Design a protein around this ligand. Structure first.
Ligand SMILES: Nc1ncnc2c1ncn2[C@@H]1O[C@H](COP(=O)(O)OP(=O)(O)O)[C@@H](O)[C@H]1O
Ligand SMILES: Nc1ncnc2c1ncn2[C@@H]1O[C@H](COP(=O)(O)OP(=O)(O)O)[C@@H](O)[C@H]1O
Ligand SMILES: Nc1ncnc2c1ncn2[C@@H]1O[C@H](COP(=O)(O)OP(=O)(O)O)[C@@H](O)[C@H]1O
Ligand SMILES: Nc1ncnc2c1ncn2[C@@H]1O[C@H](COP(=O)(O)OP(=O)(O)O)[C@@H](O)[C@H]1O
Ligand SMILES: Nc1ncnc2c1ncn2[C@@H]1O[C@H](COP(=O)(O)OP(=O)(O)O)[C@@H](O)[C@H]1O
Ligand SMILES: Nc1ncnc2c1ncn2[C@@H]1O[C@H](COP(=O)(O)OP(=O)(O)O)[C@@H](O)[C@H]1O
Ligand SMILES: Nc1ncnc2c1ncn2[C@@H]1O[C@H](COP(=O)(O)OP(=O)(O)O)[C@@H](O)[C@H]1O
Ligand SMILES: Nc1ncnc2c1ncn2[C@@H]1O[C@H](COP(=O)(O)OP(=O)(O)O)[C@@H](O)[C@H]1O
Ligand SMILES: Nc1ncnc2c1ncn2[C@@H]1O[C@H](COP(=O)(O)OP(=O)(O)O)[C@@H](O)[C@H]1O
Ligand SMILES: Nc1ncnc2c1ncn2[C@@H]1O[C@H](COP(=O)(O)OP(=O)(O)O)[C@@H](O)[C@H]1O
Ligand SMILES: O=P(O)(O)OC[C@H]1O[C@H](O)[C@H](O)[C@@H]1O
Ligand SMILES: O=P(O)(O)OC[C@H]1O[C@H](O)[C@H](O)[C@@H]1O
Ligand SMILES: O=P(O)(O)OC[C@H]1O[C@H](O)[C@H](O)[C@@H]1O
Ligand SMILES: O=P(O)(O)OC[C@H]1O[C@H](O)[C@H](O)[C@@H]1O
Ligand SMILES: O=P(O)(O)OC[C@H]1O[C@H](O)[C@H](O)[C@@H]1O
Ligand SMILES: [Mg+2]
Ligand SMILES: [Mg+2]
Ligand SMILES: [Mg+2]
Ligand SMILES: [Mg+2]
Ligand SMILES: [Mg+2]
Ligand SMILES: [Mg+2]
Ligand SMILES: [Mg+2]
Ligand SMILES: [Mg+2]
Ligand SMILES: [Mg+2]
Ligand SMILES: [Mg+2]
Lengths: 316, 316, 316, 316, 316
């Protein structure tokens, strides 16, 4: 079997980068819409007995892209592909990973079941919002970390990183922030927005010392940037000299760009798990860490039957 | 269909309390071992068209108890029970909820699959180590909270609770601690044991102020009590006046009892999701919050087709 | 794909013998218990695209070992093994193969379903208590016979084997005894313990002539040795000169060792599907037929895509 | 839900007897063949929310009848029946219950899987050739015994039954014969046809004493009657005064009728799990035990959610 | 893996032709009936790791043949075949492809489910009665067309084919007839038998002009030939000079041979998806298009991982 890399409509630049790093051309696919807005998928080459990797991030037109991915997976399976792997850099519906409300769906589990029934044999993803999403499948799920790339960026772009403090913008980010602070041998802090019992002012509590130090906000994603912007205001109010925000998934939906442009961030750093070209044109603060080499190495090692553990300590 | 409550060998006192609160006698079951240590299950009454609830905590002889539960579920299903619900107050293998190591099993997902294939239609559990374990099943999973009972105990047993600080013993407990601190309108702190890069001394970092205040350690479980004991030493070293530990699952395996007896805890508070009678005989610091009323109300509402949302704000 | 042989905690000497006969080292696995007695499995090498064989007998801590086997199977499957085969020399819960009582579980079927959901693709076992257990799976199940090794032992160790009579200790062993008697061209007899209608003395009926002849008791297993010991008393009372007992699974649980030491057996012969080192130290009558060559040949032929029919007529 | 009894083409007289004992009319079904010999099933009434019981024995045109049963089960399921139960008095392919030959199918398991995928929720059958066939399903399987009816017939029709010996025609029938002999408090014997190593004369070995006593051959089925006829010749050669044959499934295929007419049987007794009207017209020795009351009681108790254990000790 | 071609009892001449075109001998299989008319399948060689193709048409003893095919598929799967493909030239129960009546089964879906549960990994068939039957499976289904062979026969055997009109015998054949007429650049007509509201005379309506032209009836199958015979009478009554009938599946059950012999057909042309040797002996009008080369090429390309699209434009 040979590696066949197919791109959905979501992140075709990332698919191209992965294919170039693998020394391959992208597989021939026409991914369009019928007139009635139904997804049209036209695989333009044989995938018989091939090791098919479909790159599709959960971003942009989320349901459009997920349906595109499912249809492409099913087409490859019925076309007798040896193995179909869904490379989903940003897993859609990952934040709907539990039922903590009455009648609430576990949409991440539904997406996992849909991918399984479409015929996916393997999932490659980066920085799942909850790592337990790996357990939502009965197939192997690669949950790659952007943490080595984040550490590289911090050590190369922040002069006073050895005296910095890594800040969690919410309680759920504590593990990620503590891991990064341990790897950098720096202090960490946590910011919590307390629960909205009524319609008074949202107030943020900070635990840890950030006074007269550079604060690096690290989180898994910035959708509306309410979390990171509120954390940034709190950090400046607490005496932080400079505030950075580093995310792996830059969704930047809704008012995020205006929020960041009016915030105090020295830089907002995201990976290219989601296309950022449009976002960077309206926000100069955004910088992008390319993770295409990580995904390409993961695909290559999956095809060659080699461990991907190397990707959790080094940036290829 | 009628409620049939069956007890495994793990926590029969809790099963009795649930049955009494439901105004029922426990179903007739003989749960023993064959000579070769294979689990022997002898259901002593018809469950045809009945709503069967099997109470079995993940504690004691873990694999023995889980096999007992699976065999009882399968026997009830083949005996044409209308519905089989596994009441698992402490979910076994819940800490193995992700693959963050090479070749690591997701044992929680395997346990969920085993329960599903045994024929469970419903799971009732308390304070899952990861709430995403709800997504490991395709059946409804009730993840009950001991938090209302914990808040009741704090308000009734700690005189200075309004000036206390709720402390997370690790980074993963941050959400639970922030929720409790919000409900009590008190400060919170977090304690992190940094990663063991080599064989030097384990050192703990505390973020937040606990000086001259009562510190309440809140966590989901205390297995060996290394986490809570190390956190307690750190809290006293940081100037805490008194230190409490409140858990929902008191496993207290291995050296936990000696650790607690030699620690500085004012009280170690656990629920009775795991039997504590033996533990209390060797550690006077342990106190037990009865959660049998919560489980009984959950079972009764499940049988009657009523919401269990009331259990997340009140202790019945 | 390459053969990877992994040992559970149950029978590691047999796993070592199989690996030596295959010219391989055992795969690196740490199979221990967490403090709370949950099974801990740490596969120490890649199994990507490998043909994994996990050796785990149903013996000793039965539920412990079965959970170990299931966790190891699931870990290998999620670790992208090409194929996972469970080598289970003595199938656990094999005697619970039917529902002939109200509410009785079919525990063998539950174990088969658990192995299937863990991800086993192939089962290799020896002398299933019921051969229909092969039908409990939807995957191929190799039910190897110890009969050629038993015939070899009889012809090499019993001088008057041509005038012996092979005796079934119960009605269920009749097929095995008739097959062995046909292969040896000798007489056979059957012993039946009639059903316990009340609390009077257990009485045994013998059909067939054993007077002044060597009697060989052949059965699939000896758990408590009540069956073989009662049959031995009956055979001596019926005029048998010498009495042998040949089993394939020597469980020897409970009072079996004292029963055998106080019985009249010339020799109790078992295979090493279950470890016998401890049993032989307390009972000199026990002798062991090594079947590691049969299992090793079965594994080798399974890997090479060759028939295992040769194993049913010859001992390699 | 109401009981709906539907008859296949196999045994419509038995279906009528069951319906009369249940005080019901048979459900309206047209079960014919299309011109190209495809099975045509036309259910003539609504089964929405009904408790559907389909009576179809494995006899006559075996594959025709099994396909008829599967199509009727699937039609009832798609027609929104509350529950579909397959009443299969003689389970087809039951003798293909294991893989003891290279490349041999387990046809009983395939039939079970086909019934499961057709949508059967419950199986009611009589005297499975192997009771482990219950484990071939994941649904409840009722394996009713004709033994109480057989004991009733023996006590009412054989004057010297207290001095009789119950004879197994092969090694596999030993459990059934020992159970019957225990219930009658009589002796038992076993007859074995040794394996055909070459083309010499088939010779039968008898263990047990039948001289000058009435011999009752008891087996689960008589297909070609080679087993019972050879056993009858052996029993007469051994000095039996009279020889009876009692089966639960009278298949009587091929040369069975001529074999019985030329045999020495006092009577050949079968149940009506298979239609016997044609067989009795050509063989006066055949007598029929009606088991329609057992099946009707089983269906009624299944519908009413009552235990069928009463059917294993009494004939209703 | 190597191609292994196994023949069922249905169409062994076609299997032989396929094997010869593949340069192979048919796999050793004994496909007979037990005495009680149960299907007996004895695969006479190893299929371990082999690419197994089982040829079995839906014809003759339909349920017999389908059960034979299912048993052979399951035997090959349990015998550890690498892949099992069911080559079903005429799909049985294909006309039962929808539920347009109360309580009607979808027998085609049931057959698909039975093939899936037997373990088929791939289906190769010719001219499905409904192409949507491909969607009844979750495995790849090759729906080969006899249309190129039909066009070849028309261009080589009908001198005035350029002035002919291709006639649909019913409304459902319109797509097939329009496709053929487009490929031949000829006119088309449609014949409809209006619905039987009462017991008056069946009357046929013809849309299109067939006067003084050769009419070619093209349909997917001729079971009883009522459709084609009635269409032929209508076509002659409408002024057609000569009438041909071309089918891909010649079932010719029941009165079809007498109907054709008394009809006005110049020739009745069928493929050999169903054996026609017996039919041709009683009807000189029947001619056979060999499609064994199409099936052999499909099998060869499936084994070699090559597209079968070439088969839809050319006859190999
Ligand atoms: N795509 C989404 N965008 C915004 N909010 C979401 C989205 N999906 C889910 N949510 C909401 O956010 C919740 C998850 O919140 P999160 O901050 O991820 O962690 P936690 O629920 O543990 O506090 C969900 O329960 C739901 O109410
Ligand atoms: N150091 C690590 N940190 C986090 N996750 C890891 C780590 N090592 C492995 N994993 C997880 O395990 C998966 C597979 O691990 P890997 O080492 O590539 O080999 P194997 O597939 O045999 O386990 C990765 O995709 C990742 O999800
Ligand atoms: N029963 C157990 N007892 C002790 N350690 C366990 C147990 N089950 C799993 N573990 C280990 O603990 C890890 C889980 O650690 P935990 O403190 O729950 O959270 P995190 O892994 O997110 O830091 C597992 O990956 C495994 O290495
Ligand atoms: N306030 C809450 N906090 C956390 N989990 C909740 C809450 N309300 C509901 N749940 C979860 O939802 C499950 C079922 O919710 P419930 O309100 O009883 O009704 P429904 O089953 O219709 O959703 C509970 O068992 C629990 O797991
Ligand atoms: N591990 C076990 N040890 C002892 N008895 C067992 C065990 N498992 C099941 N049993 C009991 O033994 C019965 C099986 O008996 P056995 O001698 O194997 O054959 P039979 O039931 O056909 O007479 C089961 O139905 C159950 O009552
Ligand atoms: N002579 C035999 N006696 C009993 N079982 C047998 C015999 N031959 C084969 N089997 C069964 O069939 C299985 C597989 O058979 P084998 O001859 O190795 O080839 P295949 O897998 O192609 O059938 C064996 O593992 C065993 O369970
Ligand atoms: N319908 C049938 N009619 C005749 N023989 C059959 C039938 N089905 C299977 N067989 C054969 O008989 C064998 C089963 O033999 P049986 O007497 O029931 O018990 P055992 O195989 O345990 O000696 C099968 O393995 C097969 O070879
Ligand atoms: N005495 C018995 N002998 C044999 N099989 C029995 C006996 N009692 C029950 N069974 C089996 O168990 C099945 C169901 O048992 P039953 O007593 O009716 O209640 P339940 O379904 O709750 O187990 C029966 O259909 C039969 O297969
Ligand atoms: N093997 C068969 N032989 C004859 N008629 C059949 C067969 N299978 C199904 N039928 C009947 O024919 C119907 C299908 O008719 P057909 O001419 O194929 O198309 P349509 O139903 O779309 O008009 C089925 O609904 C059923 O009533
Ligand atoms: N021109 C066509 N007309 C009709 N069906 C087609 C055509 N091309 C392909 N198919 C269908 O697609 C199946 C597989 O197509 P093929 O071109 O062989 O490659 P792939 O399997 O990769 O799709 C065929 O078996 C057939 O059912
Ligand atoms: O749009 P925002 O909610 O600010 O950003 C997404 C956040 O929501 C979730 O907690 C994620 O972990 C992030 O912290
Ligand atoms: O025995 P210990 O590890 O101290 O207690 C169990 C802890 O391990 C996990 O993090 C749980 O969340 C607890 O904090
Ligand atoms: O401990 P024991 O019951 O004596 O030995 C196990 C027996 O139980 C079952 O019948 C097995 O076939 C053996 O004959
Ligand atoms: O036609 P026959 O083989 O004589 O009768 C069927 C027999 O085959 C099987 O062993 C059944 O248990 C019966 O004893
Ligand atoms: O026996 P006949 O019904 O005439 O031939 C079979 C027909 O029935 C279905 O419509 C097929 O498409 C054919 O047109
Ligand atoms: Mg979250
Ligand atoms: Mg967050
Ligand atoms: Mg954890
Ligand atoms: Mg923790
Ligand atoms: Mg048994
Ligand atoms: Mg026995
Ligand atoms: Mg048998
Ligand atoms: Mg028999
Ligand atoms: Mg149609
Ligand atoms: Mg038609």
């Amino acid at each position: 079997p040979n590696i066949k890399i197919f791109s959905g409509s979501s992140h075709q630049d990332l698919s191209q980068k992965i294919a170039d790093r693998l020394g391959l051309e992208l597989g021939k696919v026409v991914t369009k819409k019928f007139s009635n807005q139904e997804t049209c998928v036209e695989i333009g080459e044989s995938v018989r007995g091939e090791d098919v990797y479909i790159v599709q991030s959960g971003c942009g037109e989320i349901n459009d892209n997920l349906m595109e991915l499912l249809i492409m997976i099913n087409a490859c399976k019925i076309a007798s592909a040896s193995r179909v792997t869904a490379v989903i850099p940003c897993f859609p519906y990952a934040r709907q990973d539990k039922k903590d409300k009455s009648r609430a769906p576990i949409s991440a589990k539904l997406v996992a079941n849909m991918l399984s029934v479409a015929g996916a044999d393997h999932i490659i993803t980066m920085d799942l919002h909850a790592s337990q999403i790996q357990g939502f499948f009965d197939i192997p799920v690669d949950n790659l970390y952007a943490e080595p790339a984040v550490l590289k960026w911090i050590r190369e772009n922040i002069s006073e990183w050895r005296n910095c403090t890594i800040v969690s913008p919410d309680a759920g980010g504590a593990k990620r922030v503590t891991s990064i602070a341990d790897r950098l041998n720096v202090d960490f802090a946590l910011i919590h927005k307390e629960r909205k019992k009524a319609n008074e002012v949202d107030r943020m509590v900070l635990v840890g010392d950030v006074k007269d130090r550079v604060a690096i906000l690290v989180d898994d994603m910035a959708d509306t940037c309410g979390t990171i912007c509120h954390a940034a205001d709190k950090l400046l109010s607490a005496g932080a000299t400079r505030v950075y925000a580093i995310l792996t998934h830059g969704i930047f939906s809704g008012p995020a760009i205006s929020r960041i442009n009016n915030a105090c961030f020295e830089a907002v750093v995201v990976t290219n798990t989601i296309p950022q070209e449009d976002k960077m044109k309206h926000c100069s603060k955004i910088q992008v860490i390319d993770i295409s080499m990580i995904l390409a190495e993961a695909i290559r090692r999956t095809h060659n039957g080699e461990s991907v553990s190397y990707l959790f300590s080094h940036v290829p």
